Paper text:
A defining structural characteristic of SCRIB includes the presence of four clustered PDZ domains in the C-terminal portion of the polypeptide. Without significant expression of necessary PDZ proteins, α1D-ARs are retained intracellularly and produce weak functional responses, suggesting this protein:protein interaction site has the potential for pharmacological modulation.
Our model identified D571α1D-AR:R1110PDZ4 of the carboxylate binding loop and T570α1D-AR:H1170PDZ4 of α-helix B as possible α1D-CT PDZ ligand interaction sites within SCRIB PDZ4. SCRIB PDZ domain sequence alignment revealed that R1110, but not H1170, is unique to PDZ4, suggesting that this residue may be responsible for the specificity of α1D-AR to PDZ4. A superposition of the R1110G mutant with WT PDZ4 reveals a 4.5 Å shift of the carboxylate binding loop. We predict this shift creates steric hindrance that prevents the interaction between I572α1D-AR and PDZ4.
Residue numbers in the entry: -1 to 0, 1098 to 1189
Amino acid sequence: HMLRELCIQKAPGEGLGISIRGGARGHAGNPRDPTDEGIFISKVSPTGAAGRDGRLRVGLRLLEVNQQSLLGLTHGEAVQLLRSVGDTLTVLVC
């Protein structure tokens, strides 16, 4: 699980084209051990930017988007980061 930063081309108004899961847990979780709150890629759309680039896969841990930590962000805020404008988007994964 080597930490790596990927810069992925996309159309300037397009999102990265991945689905994510994880993040802060609720009342089934364990606040004494918050290390199971990572964000992971759960889908890669074949025609989206991540799919076209070919590198990202389901199961990767996603630590940052555009240099910003996902830790503690809500799902919706992480999705919004993945929809940031620009002709590239950067992810930090392992």
